[PDB]
Design an enzyme around this catalytic site. Structure first.
Site, short mmCIF file in Angstrom:
data_model
loop_
_atom_site.label_atom_id
_atom_site.label_comp_id
_atom_site.label_asym_id
_atom_site.label_seq_id
_atom_site.Cartn_x
_atom_site.Cartn_y
_atom_site.Cartn_z
N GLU A 177 0.80 -1.26 0.00
CA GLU A 177 0.00 0.00 0.00
C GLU A 177 0.80 1.27 0.00
O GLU A 177 0.27 2.34 0.34
CB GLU A 177 -0.98 0.02 1.19
CG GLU A 177 -2.00 -1.10 1.09
CD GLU A 177 -2.93 -0.99 -0.10
OE1 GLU A 177 -3.46 -2.03 -0.54
OE2 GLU A 177 -3.18 0.13 -0.61
N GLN B 281 -10.86 10.65 -1.98
CA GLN B 281 -10.50 10.18 -0.64
C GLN B 281 -9.21 10.84 -0.15
O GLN B 281 -9.06 11.08 1.07
CB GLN B 281 -10.37 8.63 -0.62
CG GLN B 281 -10.02 8.02 0.76
CD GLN B 281 -9.81 6.48 0.72
OE1 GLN B 281 -8.66 5.98 0.63
NE2 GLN B 281 -10.91 5.73 0.82
N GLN C 243 -12.90 3.60 6.36
CA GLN C 243 -13.12 4.97 5.90
C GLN C 243 -13.58 5.88 7.04
O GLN C 243 -13.60 7.10 6.88
CB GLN C 243 -14.14 4.96 4.77
CG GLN C 243 -13.56 4.26 3.52
CD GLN C 243 -14.56 4.07 2.42
OE1 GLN C 243 -15.16 5.04 1.93
NE2 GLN C 243 -14.74 2.83 2.00
N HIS D 126 -6.93 -2.79 5.57
CA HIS D 126 -7.05 -1.32 5.39
C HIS D 126 -7.37 -0.59 6.70
O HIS D 126 -6.89 0.53 6.93
CB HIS D 126 -8.16 -0.94 4.41
CG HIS D 126 -7.81 -1.13 2.96
ND1 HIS D 126 -6.53 -1.03 2.49
CD2 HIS D 126 -8.60 -1.39 1.89
CE1 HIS D 126 -6.53 -1.25 1.18
NE2 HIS D 126 -7.78 -1.45 0.79
P1 LIG Z 1 -8.50 -1.63 -0.78
O1 LIG Z 1 -7.36 -1.34 -1.74
O2 LIG Z 1 -9.16 -2.99 -0.84
O3 LIG Z 1 -9.66 -0.51 -0.89
C1 LIG Z 1 -9.26 0.86 -0.98
C2 LIG Z 1 -10.35 1.78 -0.50
O4 LIG Z 1 -11.50 1.46 -1.26
C3 LIG Z 1 -12.59 1.16 -0.41
N1 LIG Z 1 -13.41 0.07 -0.97
C4 LIG Z 1 -12.95 -1.06 -1.59
N2 LIG Z 1 -13.97 -1.88 -1.95
C5 LIG Z 1 -15.09 -1.29 -1.53
C6 LIG Z 1 -16.52 -1.62 -1.57
N3 LIG Z 1 -16.95 -2.79 -2.12
N4 LIG Z 1 -17.36 -0.74 -0.99
C7 LIG Z 1 -16.97 0.41 -0.44
N5 LIG Z 1 -15.70 0.78 -0.37
C8 LIG Z 1 -14.73 -0.02 -0.89
C9 LIG Z 1 -11.91 0.61 0.86
O5 LIG Z 1 -12.81 0.60 2.00
C10 LIG Z 1 -10.68 1.50 0.96
O6 LIG Z 1 -11.05 2.76 1.55
NA NA Z 2 -2.36 0.55 -4.27
#
Ligand SMILES: *P(=O)(O)OC[C@H]1O[C@@H](n2cnc3c(N)ncnc32)[C@H](O)[C@@H]1O
Ligand code: NA
Length: 336
Positions: free
Chosen positions: A11, A101, A285, A306
């Site tokens: 990351e 974000q 988040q 995360h």
């Molecule tokens: P990661 O690299 O897995 O995710 C990065 C950010 O994106 C948000 N996120 C990923 N997948 C979803 C879904 N299905 N719904 C809402 N938010 C998502 C993660 O929570 C990380 O902030």
């Molecule tokens: Na990345």
């Protein structure tokens, strides 16, 4: 002084970079990240990562070193965050909402309201959909005292670009302490399919598959213009007494409608199998906004990578500390 972060445990161009950029801009503390993506076949900063660096630089007049494709080291020295009307372009390589974000938390602390518009991919598997930001995250931000409104203007379905998402934001006037726990009763379940240049029977089978596992109070099918596609997503919103959550899956070539919907069913069942209001993704988040408020808590059934990454970055930039306490299959995440 200079906070040094490691970019090689994962990351380093992604969740650590985004959270570090926001926290750096808010606190005025410079940072460096090294070994960014050093073990990936195409290593270092790629174009989508650079877009976030460049966007952050624009909103705070930063001085930067190493912000070049393939660089494995970045030094970021922020200036003063300023409000304004900003437009960024990440293209098919990245996600509009991940650029948002990065920058929105800093603009909560700007010297006036701002509008940020980003073009690029909108319906990407590992990014929050604009509807999740609007309908899940933003109501909770409001409870914390943070006011922002996100609208999707057009779709660009992974892996293409062309989408556009915009957010209006105001600086915070006062923070509040948000405390979430149990989900409470179901109010309604809403199922949605988006199709673009994809036959209507797909959406029919997808809604029918969702209806096979849940009693759906709302069912929505939306056919978009051809040139926003090809694309297809299926979503399920769970509106409960204490929170609204949303889950989604993106259609892929060589995965049939039935299997796409089954994936969404499995995820929603997993959510409903625990008592917690906050879902796996929302949890990560909420870490920054709660930290910036100085207090807050929620429960979540499985703390993700995360979530723990964001906690670790926050704790480098702020005196805030998080407590995680597991009780009967859910973890209470709280600011001490
Ligand atoms: P990661 O690299 O897995 O995710 C990065 C950010 O994106 C948000 N996120 C990923 N997948 C979803 C879904 N299905 N719904 C809402 N938010 C998502 C993660 O929570 C990380 O902030
Ligand atoms: Na990345």
């Amino acid at each position: 002084r200079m906070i040094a972060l490691d970019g090689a445990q994962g990351e380093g161009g992604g969740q650590i970079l985004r959270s570090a950029l926001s926290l750096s801009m808010i606190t005025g503390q410079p940072f460096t990240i090294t070994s960014i993506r050093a073990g990936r076949a195409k290593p270092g900063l790629l174009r989508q990562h650079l877009t976030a660096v460049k966007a952050a630089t624009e909103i705070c007049g930063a001085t930067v070193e190493g912000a070049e494709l393939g660089s494995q080291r970045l030094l970021f020295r922020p200036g003063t965050v300023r409000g304004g009307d900003y437009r960024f372009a990440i293209g098919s390589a990245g996600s509009c909402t991940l650029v948002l974000q990065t920058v929105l938390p800093a603009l909560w602390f700007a010297d006036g309201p701002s509008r940020v518009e980003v073009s690029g991919g909108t319906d990407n598997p590992s990014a929050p959909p604009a509807d999740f930001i609007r309908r899940v995250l933003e109501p909770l931000l409001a409870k914390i005292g943070i006011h922002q409104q996100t609208t999707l203007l057009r779709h660009g379905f992974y892996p293409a670009g062309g989408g556009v998402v915009a957010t209006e934001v105001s600086p915070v006037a006062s923070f509040n302490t948000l405390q979430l726990g149990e989900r409470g009763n179901i109010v309604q379940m809403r199922g949605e399919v988006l199709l673009a240049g994809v036959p209507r029977h797909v959406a029919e089978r997808e809604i029918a598959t969702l209806a096979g596992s849940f009693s759906l109070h709302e069912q929505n099918i939306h056919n978009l213009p051809r040139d926003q596609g090809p694309g297809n997503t299926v979503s399920l919103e769970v509106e409960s007494e204490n929170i609204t959550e949303r889950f989604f899956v993106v259609g892929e070539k060589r995965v049939s409608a039935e299997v796409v919907a089954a994936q969404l069913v499995k995820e929603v069942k997993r959510y409903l199998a625990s008592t917690a209001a906050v879902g796996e993704y929302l949890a990560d988040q909420l870490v920054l906004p709660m930290a910036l408020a100085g207090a807050g808590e929620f429960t979540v059934a499985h703390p993700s990578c995360h979530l723990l990454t964001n906690i670790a970055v926050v704790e480098r930039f702020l005196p805030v500390r998080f407590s995680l306490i597991e009780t009967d299959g859910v973890t209470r995440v709280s600011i001490e």
